[PDB]
Design a protein around this ligand. Structure first.
Ligand SMILES: [Zn+2]
Ligand SMILES: [Zn+2]
Length: 75
């Protein structure tokens, strides 16, 4: 009936629509506190790396960027 979407940013079956995408719950909060580019965000490599687990204390910038990649909006 409808393709199953998931945490467009970093997890799995999103609890539902919040930003405008089937995004996560907790990691979703990270995005709320991180919206807007202006931020001292940065990855310990800035090279390449897939974002998944939360921890909200590791690839935080790739997460954010990925969140902006998701195409969300604080809402
Ligand atoms: Zn997530
Ligand atoms: Zn990274």
């Amino acid at each position: 009936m409808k393709e199953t979407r998931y945490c467009a940013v970093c997890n799995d079956y999103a609890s539902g629509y919040h930003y405008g995408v089937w995004s996560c719950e907790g990691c979703k909060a990270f995005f709320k506190r991180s919206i807007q580019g202006h931020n001292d965000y940065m990855c310990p490599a800035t090279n390449q790396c897939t974002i998944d687990k939360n921890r909200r204390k590791s690839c935080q910038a790739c997460r954010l960027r990925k969140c902006y990649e998701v195409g969300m909006m604080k809402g």
